[PDB]
Amino acid sequence: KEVRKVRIALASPEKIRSWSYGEVEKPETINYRTLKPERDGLFDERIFGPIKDYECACGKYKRQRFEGKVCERCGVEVTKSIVRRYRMGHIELATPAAHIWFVKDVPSKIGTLLDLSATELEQVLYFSKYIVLDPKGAILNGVPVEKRQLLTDEEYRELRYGKQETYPLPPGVDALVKDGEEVVKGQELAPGVVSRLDGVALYRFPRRVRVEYVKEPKDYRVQPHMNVVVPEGARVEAGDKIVAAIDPEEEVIAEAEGVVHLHEPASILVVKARVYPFEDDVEVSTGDRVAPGDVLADGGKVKSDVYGRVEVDLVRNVVRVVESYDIDARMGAEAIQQLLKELDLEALEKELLEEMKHPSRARRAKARKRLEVVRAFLDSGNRPEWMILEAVPVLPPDLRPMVQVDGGRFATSDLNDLYRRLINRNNRLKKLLAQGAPEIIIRNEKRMLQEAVDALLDNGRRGAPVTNPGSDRPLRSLTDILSGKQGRFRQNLLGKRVDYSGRSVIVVGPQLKLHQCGLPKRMALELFKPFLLKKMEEKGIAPNVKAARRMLERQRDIKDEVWDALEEVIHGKVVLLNRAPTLHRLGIQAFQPVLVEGQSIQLHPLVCEAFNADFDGDQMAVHVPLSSFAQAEARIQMLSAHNLLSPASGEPLAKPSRDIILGLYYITQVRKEKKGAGLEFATPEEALAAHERGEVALNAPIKVAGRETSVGRLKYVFANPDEALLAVAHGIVDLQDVVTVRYMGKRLETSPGRILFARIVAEAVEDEKVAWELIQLDVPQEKNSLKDLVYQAFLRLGMEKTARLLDALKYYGFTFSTTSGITIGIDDAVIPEEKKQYLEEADRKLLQIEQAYEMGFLTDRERYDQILQLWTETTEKVTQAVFKNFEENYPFNPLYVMAQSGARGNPQQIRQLCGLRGLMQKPSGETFEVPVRSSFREGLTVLEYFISSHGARKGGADTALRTADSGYLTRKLVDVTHEIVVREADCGTTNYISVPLFQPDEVTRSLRLRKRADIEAGLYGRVLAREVEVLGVRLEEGRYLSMDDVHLLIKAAEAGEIQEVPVRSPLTCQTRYGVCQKCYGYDLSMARPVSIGEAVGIVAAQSIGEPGTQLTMRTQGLPRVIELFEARRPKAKAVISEIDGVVRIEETEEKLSVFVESEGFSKEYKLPKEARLLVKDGDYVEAGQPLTRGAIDPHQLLEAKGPEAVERYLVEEIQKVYRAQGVKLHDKHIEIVVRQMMKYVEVTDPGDSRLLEGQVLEKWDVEALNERLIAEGKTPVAWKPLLMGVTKSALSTKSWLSAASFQNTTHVLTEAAIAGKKDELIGLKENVILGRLIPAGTGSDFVRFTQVVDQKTLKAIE
Amino acid sequence: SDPVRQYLHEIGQVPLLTLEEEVELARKVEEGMEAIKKLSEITGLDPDLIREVVRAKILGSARVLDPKTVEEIDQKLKSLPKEHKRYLHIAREGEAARQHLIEANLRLVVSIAKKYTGRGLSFLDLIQEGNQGLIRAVEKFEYKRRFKFSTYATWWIRQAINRAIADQARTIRIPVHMVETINKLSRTARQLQQELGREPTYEEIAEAMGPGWDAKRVEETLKIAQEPVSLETPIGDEKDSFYGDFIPDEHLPSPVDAATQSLLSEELEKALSKLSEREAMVLKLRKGLIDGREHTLEEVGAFFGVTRERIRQIENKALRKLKYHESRTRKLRDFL
Amino acid sequence: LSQFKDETNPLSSLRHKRRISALGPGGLTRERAGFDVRDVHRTHYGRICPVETPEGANIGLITSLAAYARVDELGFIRTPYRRVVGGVVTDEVVYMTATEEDRYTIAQANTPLEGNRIAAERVVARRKGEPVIVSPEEVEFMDVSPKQVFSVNTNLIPFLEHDDANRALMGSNMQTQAVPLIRAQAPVVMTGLE
DNA sequence: GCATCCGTGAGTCGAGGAAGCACAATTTAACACTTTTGTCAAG
DNA sequence: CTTGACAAAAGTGTTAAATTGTGCTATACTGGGAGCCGTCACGGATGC
Ligand SMILES: [Mg+2]
Ligand SMILES: [Mg+2]
Ligand SMILES: [Zn+2]
Ligand SMILES: [Zn+2]
C-alpha cells in the first residue's frame, strides 16, 4: 500500500533479535591477504548477504536460477547484493547495558520512572554504588537495610563479608593475647598495638613454637616457607609432625610427648565471628552461608546462632561463622533492569494521581512530570525495561563500508571501530566470567562494556570522547550521524545534490526578454544529454543512442548537426536559475534558455534585484525539470515573467533599475534657464523679439501679458508628437526644452522628452487611452513614479502587457542613458561656498565653548555633549548646502541626478564626497571630539583615515555576525510555520481584528493618523469582516480591499468618519493546520485572492527573514525582532498595571511608589529611582497599560490583558523594526507566525477528563475535547492561554519527523520513541523527508485530482 | 567520571601481600588443586565439573550449568565420609586463596601495563588483558621453587598484553607471526636510518633482515602493514568536507549502464525473432537467457529428447543465420 | 598555520609571508571570536594595516604587517619614529612598541618643516592614540612617513586618501589575485613601491 | 530564589581529495587421475 | 534422427608446504598522564 504514517517506538530484545540475520561474534572485518570478509565478523556474508549478485562465498552457485537458496557449503544466501544495505546483525551482550539516550537526556526517563536522581543513576550504572534488591534482614549500623537503598563499596563489603582487621606486630615481640581469645574495641593486643573492634583474635604466622616435653621447654624456629600444622595447646605424641616444610630435612617433629605452644605471631587478625568447637564431621564447608538454627556439626549438637559466612578451620578443629548477611545488592544496568521489570505502571499511576491532589505546587509539578512519562509508557504499549539493551543491533555493512580506493588503500567508517571495541570487550567479559575472575576484575570489565555501548550510541555525551589511536579526532557515533548541520537530516534529507544541474559565471544580457536567459551551448549539451541522444538517434546523426553517446565523448568528434538537434531539444522547455543564498522564493526563477556562444550565463537586468545579483563575479546554478509536470509548474508558476510583484509587500519587484531609471529620468526632466527670468512684455511678438536679441533664454520663465510662460511654449507649437520629434532630429529643439504640443486633442505644454515617454508607454501596452491614464506626465520619472506605473499596468492589463511594458522601459532607458552623457569627474563633486563659512562658525562656537569650560560654567560631560551637537548641526547644514547648490546651479549634475532619480546614492554618501566626512566613533563606542572636516574630493589625512577605519571595521564585523543570526532566525520561522497552507475557501468564523487607523501619540497626547504605508501594510488585500459605509460608498462584507479601497478608507479617516477597519486575519482563522482563503486575502504576488493550496507559511517565513540582513545590529534592530519572536523577557522591561484604576504617585526622597487606586483595590508598584514614568497623577490607566518607558514583557501582558492584546503588541512591535529600516512587509506574514506562537494552552482544571493540571496541549485539541465533553453532559476542561517562542513552539509540534530534523534530535526522538508517537505527515518537512508529494501547490488535495478530457471522448464515455 | 581513577582507587583497597602471606596463599591454591584432583578420582566425576562447583559455592549466589545441578553435586560431595570431606574443605580454602592472590596483585599489572600505552589499545584495555595473564600466572605458579610471585607473573602479564595488541590493534586483523615480521622490519629500518643518516631503501632493509629477504618482500610487507584511513577525516580548515564525499560508489550500475543493458536485451530479442521457434530456444538455453545459467548439449538434449551432436549443429546453423542478419542490417555492432 | 603558498604573482607570495593570523593551534576560533578581537585598536597605528583584512567571517582575524613595522625579539611589533628635540626634527629614528609609544606626543608626517625646524605653529599629534593639537615645543617624536600606517598591498593604491576604506580593502586584496600577463606593463600612476 | 552548572545553538553556495621460539592445527598450492563436455567425422 | 572415437575441461583424491593459531619464558619489579586556553546566549536542573 501507500505510506501514510510513520511510527517510532522502543525495540525489545526480542524484536532486535528478529531483525538480525545472525549474531556478530568476532571483531574481524576482512582478511588482510585475500581481502575477503571474515566469518562471524562485521562484514560476514552468511549474515548480511552476498557481496555480488547471486553468488555465494564458496562460488558454487553463480546464477539467478538458484534464487532464495542457501549454499550448504558456505551458508551464504544466493540473492541480490543490495540486501547488504538492509540486513542487520546483532551482538548478544554478556550483561545488560543501558541506552544512553534514556539516561543522560535530562530529565532521564529511567530516573523518572525509578525515582532516582541523576547522580544516583550514574553511581549505580557505572558501578560506583550498590542498590539493594533484597535486604535479607540486613542491619546497617543498627538500622535495618531497606529496598532501593544505595550502599557504597565499604558498606556493602561490611554487610556481605563482615568486619575484620589485621594488625602487624613488630618483629621479636610476643603478643599478650592468645590464639582464639575474644577481644574488645580499644583493647591492647601486643605491647605496641591496640585493636579497633571486638572479635576473635587469631595468630596469623607464629614465628616460634615452644613445645613442652615431659621428662623441657624446647623451642623451634618457624620460617616463612614453613607452616604450623597443629593448634595451640595440643598434646603431641612422639612422632607426630609439628611444623611442615618444603624440604623434609628442615621439617620439625616431636621427640616425645608434650604440649605445643604458639608464640611470636607475625600479625593478629581480629574478626567479628562466632567460634563453634566440634568433634565429629561438619555438615557445612567453607564459603557456605548459615542462619540461626541451622545445623553445623556433630549431627545437630552444634548449631549456628547468628547469620554469617561459615569457614572450617581444620588446624583448630573449630567452625567460625563470620557475622554477615546474604544481602542482595547489585550495580550496573542489571540492577536497573530488574527494578524496571518489577514496576507496576498501573499502581504507580494511581499513587501519582493521589499525590496530584497535594496542595503544594512543587509536589504537583513533580508528580505530573513522573505521571507524563508513566502515561506515555502505558499508552504506547512499550515496556520500561526495554530501555536497557540486552542485544545491540548492528548496522548493515554497506552503510558503514570498508571500501578500497583507486590507489589500493582501504577507507572505513568510524562505526566499525566502535563496533569492534564493543565486541572485544563483550568477548573478554565472557572469558573472565567463565574463569571465575574476582569481582573487581568483573566490575571493571562490565563498566568498560557499558562505556563501549555509550560511545557507539552517542560518543562524547558522557566522559572523554573516544578517539582513534594516533589522532585526537572523536569517532563519529550513531547520534552524531543523525544530528547537527552535517547530520543525515539537514545534509541528505532536507537537501540533496541533484543530477541535470550546472553552474557558471553570470553576465548581463540586455537583449534578452524578461522570460529568457542565455545558456551556454556546452552547458546545454551536458544538461540535456539524454534528450539530445534521443534526438540524434531520431535524425541520421547517429544509428543508436550508444553510438550517439560515443560521439559526444570526444570534443573533436562532435559534428555541426548536433547543435541543430540541441536547438530542437530545448524548444519550449525552461530551466531554473538559482543564486545562493536563496533568501526568498524569487531566488529561484524559470527562464526559457537561449543557446549562446561562450561559457557565462546571460541574466536579464530586470531580475537582478530579486536574485540580489551583481556582475562582479557572481555564479548561478542551472536546473532542468524533466517531466511534463515539472515543466508545467516551472512554465506557469515559476516563470520570471509571471512573478512581477513581491510576495512580501505586493509592490513591483521587477521594475526599472539603476541605468534604466537614469536614462528615463534624463529625458523626462525639463530645462530651467536664468537669462531672462522675470521680464514682462505686452505681446508675444515682443517676447520672441527679445529672444532673437539674446535678452531672454528659451526656457526662462517670463510673463507675456499676465500669464507666466516661456519663449519655447510660444515659439514652438507642434501639431502632433511626430512633428515635435522630427524637430528634435533636426536639432531645432532638445528633449529637455519645454514647448507646446497638441496630443490627444489637448494643447499640452511639455517637453518632447515627456511626450516621447508617453508614446513609449502607449506603444508597449498598445492602447493610447489607457496608457495616458497610467502615466504622470508633468514630472520627471524617478524610481517611485516608475514603480507606480508598473503596478497600475499590472492591475489594468495583466502579466503579459506589463512584461512587455517592462521590456520597453528597459530598452529605452538603456538607449537614452548611453547617449545622454552621464559621466563622473572630480569637478562633479561640487564643494559649496557655504562649507568654508560653516566651518569658521563651528570653530568660533567651539572656541567659545572652550572659554566657557575654562571659566568653569560647565562640566566635562556637558562640554562633550555640546561639542557633539555642534558638529552634528554643522554636518546637517553642510548636507543642505551641498544639495541646495545642486538644485540651484547644477540641476543636471551626475551625483545629483543619480540621487534624485533613485538610480544610485543617498544624501549621506553625497555629503561625504562633496561636504565633510563628519564625526567618527572610537572602537569603544565614543565619538572623537575632532571630526573629519575633509571630504573624499579633498582627500583625508593619514590620521583622519585611521580614525575612519574604526567605523569601517565595526560595520564589516557587524555585517558578518548578522548574517548568521538572520539566517538562523529564518530557519526557526520556517520550522514553526512550514505546515500552514491555504486549505479551504472559508472557515465560517465570525471573529475578526480591528486594524486601527489612528495612533495614540504621547508627545502631543492625542490621536494622530498613521502613515499611509503603515495602513497599507495592514489593510491591503484583506477581506472585510463587516460592512463599512464611508463617504457614501458601501464596502460590503466579504470584499477584498484593493489599494483604491485602502486609499478611500484613509480619506474617510481624514474626514473623521472611521477609526478602525474590521478585517479577517490569520489570527482569527478557525481552519485547522492552516488558514482559509477569506482569512488570508490576496496572493500579494498577483493582486488577487489567494489560491487554495498555497504554502503561505513558507512565504511568511521567507518574507520576514529576507530583509533581516538590512536590519541594524550595531533592544533595537535584528536583536529586537529575535527577542520578540522568541517571546523573551527584556532586561529593561517596562512596568504595566495589572488592574485598571487611577494612578497615585508617592515620589519621595527615599523611594518612589506608584499606586493604582480603584473603588476597593490599591496596587503598589515600587519603581526604581531612575524610572522614566510616562504616567502622571490624575490619569485613568487600564489593565496592561504601561507605567514606565521600556519594552513590555509579552508574558506579563498576556496574563494581564489577554491573547488579543499580546497578539496586537507582538505584530506592532515587530513591524516597528522593519518600518524604521524602510522595509515594507505585510502584517499577514507576521500574524501567521504569531498565530503559531499562541497555538498552545495549559490545563488549569481537568474537569471530567484524563488531562493533568498544568499539562500543555494545543488549543484546537482542548476545544474539540471540550465540545465533546459537553455533548455527553460532562464537566468541561478549564484551560489558560499560553505564549511561547518560535523555537519552543516548533519543538513541541505533533510530528516527530519535522521536530527531529530541526533541533534537539536526541531529545525529540527519545520522547517520541517512548510515547510511540505516530507521524501523520501533515506539513511540508515530513513529506520532503520521505520524498513524497508535499500537500501544497499542485500536490494539494483541492486540485490534485482534477481530470481533463475533450468533448469527443466525453461523449464516447457517455 | 574517570574510569582509570575509579579502577586505581578500587585496587588500592586490597593491601599488598607480604612474603609469608604470599606463600600461604600460593600453598593453599596448590593444595586445593590436588584436593580437587583426589575428589574427582574418588567420586569419578569430571575434574573440571567439580572445580566449577567448588568455585560456584565460593563466589556465592551473586554470580549468574544451572544452580540445581550445582546444589546436587554439592550435596553429593558433602555426603562423603569425614576423610573425603577433608579434601572438599581443602578445595574450598584453595579456591578462596586463589581469589585473594589474584586480587592482591592488581597493582602489579597496572605497573606493567602503563608501559604499553600508545600501541593501539587504551590503558584500561591493556589492564584487563594483563589481568587475564595474571589469572594464568596464578594457575601455573609453583611456590616450591622459592621464587617470588612477581618474578613469574611478569612473564604472563607481558605475554597477555603483547598478544592482545597483536590481535586487537588493527581494524584489519594481521596474524601474530606477520605482526612480529612487521615489528622486526620496522626496527631494522630504524637502525639503518640512524646509521646511514637517511631513510634506507628496500635493498638495504632486505639485506639487513637476512636470508630469504629481498626488496620485493619488503615492499609487500610494508604494503600489508598499511592501516585503513577513516571515511570521516576532515579536509581543510572548514569542517564541512570529508573523505567519504570524494569516493564514488562503483558497485551499483549507473543509469547509463542500466539503460544499455536493457537496450541490448531489447535488440537481441528482436534479432532472435527471425530465428525459428526451436532454434531461438536452443540459443537462449545454451547462453543462459532463460534460466540465467548456461545449459549444456546434453541437458538441453534431455529437454527436447535429442542427442548432443544435433544441438551443436543447429546452434551453429542458427548462429550463422544471426551473423547473416546482423551483416545485412548492422543494428547490433554498437553494443559490442 | 602551515599553508599552501599563494603565488599567483610575486605580490601574492610577498603578502602571504606578512600575514598575521589570530587563528591556529593555540589561538581564537572563527565562530568564538567577538567584536573586540576583530576591531582596529588604536595601537594598530603603524604596526597592523587598518584596511587589509578578509571580508566575511574572517574579518579582523587575519591581518597584515604594516610596511615599516618589525617584530622584535620578544614578539612585540615596533614602528619607527623620528626624534624631535627643541622643535627640530632629527634623523634619529627610534623603533618602539605600543606601550613605549603611549608616553610621548607624536606629531604627523605631513607637518610642514622649514628645513628641519617645524614651521607650523599648530601641530596635529597623537597622545595615547587621541588626536590633539600641540605647539612645536611639545612635540617629542614624528612619523617617518604616511606609508608606515598601511601594508604593502595598500601602499600600492594611488590616491588612497580619496577612497573609502571598505573599497580600499577590496583593492588591496584583489591585487593579490591578478595573473601575470605576457604583455604586462607597469601602471601609469604609481606610488613608489613598485 | 538564586547562583551555578549542564546542554544546545549560532547563514548559503563554491573550492580544497617497541620479543622470540617451538609445536600443533589449519588452509592452500600442485599434481595425478577420472568424468564430462565439446567437436569431429561417420552416417 | 544417431554412433562411436577422441580432445580438452571441470571434478575429485591425496600430498606437502605454507600459513596461522596457541602455549610458554621462574632474580625482583605492585596506583596514569595529559590535560594547561579569549563567547554568549538561552532553557532547564536539582540543589539549597
Ligand atoms: Mg557580487
Ligand atoms: Mg512658431
Ligand atoms: Zn556457496
Ligand atoms: Zn479562516
SS (H, E, C) A998-1058: EEEECCCCEEEECCHHHHHHHHCCCEECCCEEECCEEECCCCECCHHHHHHHHHHHHCCCC
A406 and A309 together in one domain: no
For C94, the domain range is: 80-144
Chain A stretch 263-282, residues whose beta carbon is closer than 8 A to a beta carbon of chain B: 266, 280-282
Rounded Cα–Cα distance for residues A433 and A426 (Å):
11
Classify residue A37 by its DSSP letter: B
A681 and A731 together in one domain: yes
Place of cell 545441578: B69
Among chain C residues, CA nearest to A929: C131
Q: What CATH number does the domain containing C133 carry?
A: 2.30.150.10
Q: Which residues contact A642 (CB under 8 A, 6 or more apart)?
A: A636, A799
Scanning chain B, the segments in alpha helix (DSSP H) are 3-11, 19-43, 47-59, 67-78, 82-103, 106-113, 123-140, 149-168, 176-196, 202-209, 215-224, 255-273, 277-286, 297-304, 308-329
Distance A603 CA to ligand 1 centre (A): 13
C162 contacts A950? CB cut-off 8 A: no
The backbone region for A652, taken as left when phi is positive above 0, alpha when psi lies in -120 to 50, beta otherwise, is: beta
Provide the 3-class DSSP secondary structure of residue A200.
strand
Q: Which of A172, A206, A169 is nearest to A316 (CA)?
A: A206
Resolution in A: 2.6
User: Would you say A1316 and A1323 are in contact if contact means Cβ atoms under 8 Å apart?
Assistant: no
Backbone angles phi, psi at B71, to 5 degrees: -65, -40
Rounded Cα–Cα distance for residues C140 and C104 (Å):
6
A1117 and A1039 together in one domain: no
A805 and A782 together in one domain: yes
DSSP secondary structure of A118-179: HHHHHHHHTTSSEEEEE--S-EETTEE--TT-EE-HHHHHHHHH--EEEEEPPTT---SSPT
Handedness of CA C15, C18, C21, C25 (dihedral sign): positive
Nucleotide in closest CA–C1' contact with A491 = D12
Q: Which of A600, A540, A548, A538 is nearest to A569 (CA)?
A: A538
Distance A1040 CA to ligand 4 centre (A): 14
A952 and A1023 together in one domain: no
User: Would you say A386 and A13 are in contact if contact means Cβ atoms under 8 Å apart?
Assistant: yes
A1313 and A1264 together in one domain: no
Taking chain C, what is the end-to-end CA distance rounded to the nearest angstrom? 28
Rounded Cα–Cα distance for residues A299 and A306 (Å):
18
Closest CA-bearing residue to C1' of E35: A464
Instruction: Find out whether B125 is annotated in a ligand binding site.
Output: no
Handedness of CA A945, A946, A947, A948 (dihedral sign): positive
Distance C165 CA to ligand 1 centre (A): 18
Q: Which residues contact B14 (CB under 8 A, 6 or more apart)?
A: A440, B103, B104, B106
* Chain B hits for A416, Cβ within 8 Å: 171
The residues facing A1089 across adjacent strands are A1082
User: Would you say B10 and A444 are in contact if contact means Cβ atoms under 8 Å apart?
Assistant: yes
The letter for the amino acid at B210 is G
Strands A717-718 and A739-743: parallel
Provide the 3-class DSSP secondary structure of residue A276.
strand
- Gap from C164 CA to chain A (nearest CA, Å): 8
Distance A1132 CA to ligand 2 centre (A): 73
Closest partner residue to C40 (CB to CB) among A923, A928, A936 is A923
Distance A39 CA to ligand 3 centre (A): 13
Backbone angles phi, psi at B182, to 5 degrees: -65, -40
Distance A57 CA to ligand 3 centre (A): 5
The experimental technique used to determine this model is cryo-EM
A816 and A840 together in one domain: no
B86 contacts A402? CB cut-off 8 A: no
Rounded Cα–Cα distance for residues A760 and A120 (Å):
83
- Gap from B227 CA to chain A (nearest CA, Å): 8
DSSP secondary structure of B104-127: TTHHHHHHHHTTSTTSSS-HHHHH
Classify residue A719 by its DSSP letter: S
User: Would you say A28 and A101 are in contact if contact means Cβ atoms under 8 Å apart?
Assistant: no
Rounded Cα–Cα distance for residues A260 and B136 (Å):
39
How many beta-carbon contacts under 8 Å exist across A and C?
81
A997 and A1025 together in one domain: yes
Q: Is C50 near chain A, with CB under 8 Å?
A: yes
Maximal CA-CA distance, chain B: 106
How many CB atoms are closer than 10 A to CB A1189?
Answer: 13
Distance B190 CA to D20 C1' (A): 19
Distance A462 CA to D4 C1' (A): 20
- To which H or E segment does residue A480 belong? helix A478-482
C124 contacts A960? CB cut-off 8 A: no
A456 and A583 together in one domain: no
* Chain B hits for A29, Cβ within 8 Å: 171-173
- Residue A1246 C-alpha cell reads as 481537568
User: Would you say A868 and A926 are in contact if contact means Cβ atoms under 8 Å apart?
Assistant: no
Closest partner residue to A950 (CB to CB) among C39, C57, C161 is C39
Provide the 3-class DSSP secondary structure of residue A699.
coil
Rounded Cα–Cα distance for residues A928 and A926 (Å):
7
Closest CA-bearing residue to C1' of D13: A580
Chain A stretch 210-239, residues whose beta carbon is closer than 8 A to a beta carbon of chain B: 224-225, 227
Instruction: Find out whether B48 is annotated in a ligand binding site.
Output: no
Distances in Å between the Cα of A514 and the Cα atoms of A85, A312, A510, A571, A575 are 48, 104, 10, 17, 14
Distance A773 CA to ligand 2 centre (A): 29
Chain B stretch 96-135, residues whose beta carbon is closer than 8 A to a beta carbon of chain A: 96, 99, 102-103, 106, 118, 120-122, 124-125, 127-129, 131-132, 135
Q: Which of A139, A477, A149 is nearest to A308 (CA)?
A: A139
Closest partner residue to A956 (CB to CB) among C45, C55, C124 is C55
- Gap from C126 CA to chain A (nearest CA, Å): 9
Q: Which residues contact A1212 (CB under 8 A, 6 or more apart)?
A: none
A937 contacts C162? CB cut-off 8 A: yes
Backbone angles phi, psi at C89, to 5 degrees: -90, 120
Strands A295-297 and A302-303: antiparallel
Burial group, residue A372, by CB count within 10 angstroms (0-12, 13-18, 19+): middle
Q: Which of A436, A444, A128 is nearest to B129 (CA)?
A: A444
The residues facing A520 across adjacent strands are A596
Mutual orientation of helices B82-103 and B123-140 as an angle, nearest 10°?
Answer: 150
Classify residue A466 by its DSSP letter: P
Closest partner residue to C110 (CB to CB) among A936, A941, A955 is A941
Distances in Å between the Cα of A1299 and the Cα atoms of A469, A664, A1153, A1333 are 36, 52, 47, 19
Q: Which of A244, A435, A284 is nearest to B95 (CA)?
A: A435
Q: Which residues contact A209 (CB under 8 A, 6 or more apart)?
A: A219, A220, A222, A228, A242, A243, A252, A260, A261, A262, A263
Rounded Cα–Cα distance for residues B270 and B275 (Å):
10
Rounded Cα–Cα distance for residues A945 and A958 (Å):
20
Rounded Cα–Cα distance for residues A507 and C39 (Å):
36
A375 and A479 together in one domain: yes
Residues in chain C: 194
For A1356, the domain range is: 1345-1358
Residues in chain A: 1358
- Residue A612 C-alpha cell reads as 540580489
Which positions on chain E have an atom < 7 Å from some protein CB?
1-4, 19-33, 35, 37-40, 42-47
The residues facing A603 across adjacent strands are A508
- Gap from A616 CA to chain C (nearest CA, Å): 12
A1319 and A1358 together in one domain: no
User: Would you say A1225 and A1107 are in contact if contact means Cβ atoms under 8 Å apart?
Assistant: yes
Report if CB A961 to strand D is under 7 Å.
Answer: no
User: Would you say A659 and A814 are in contact if contact means Cβ atoms under 8 Å apart?
Assistant: yes
User: Would you say A995 and A1010 are in contact if contact means Cβ atoms under 8 Å apart?
Assistant: no
Nucleotide in closest CA–C1' contact with A36 = D27
- To which H or E segment does residue A235 belong? strand A234-236
Rounded Cα–Cα distance for residues A612 and A300 (Å):
101
Classify residue A547 by its DSSP letter: H
Chain B stretch 39-98, residues whose beta carbon is closer than 8 A to a beta carbon of chain A: 52, 55, 57-63, 78, 81-82, 85-86, 88-89, 92-93, 95-96
Provide the 3-class DSSP secondary structure of residue B323.
helix
Distances in Å between the Cα of A920 and the Cα atoms of A945, A954, A1176, B20, C95 are 10, 12, 39, 87, 29
- Gap from C150 CA to chain A (nearest CA, Å): 10
- Residue A1076 C-alpha cell reads as 482559509
* Chain C hits for A957, Cβ within 8 Å: 35, 38-39, 59-60
The backbone region for A557, taken as left when phi is positive above 0, alpha when psi lies in -120 to 50, beta otherwise, is: alpha
- Gap from A99 CA to chain C (nearest CA, Å): 33
A969 and A1008 together in one domain: no
User: Would you say A842 and A871 are in contact if contact means Cβ atoms under 8 Å apart?
Assistant: yes
Among chain C residues, CA nearest to A955: C166
Q: What CATH number does the domain containing A286 carry?
A: 2.40.50.100
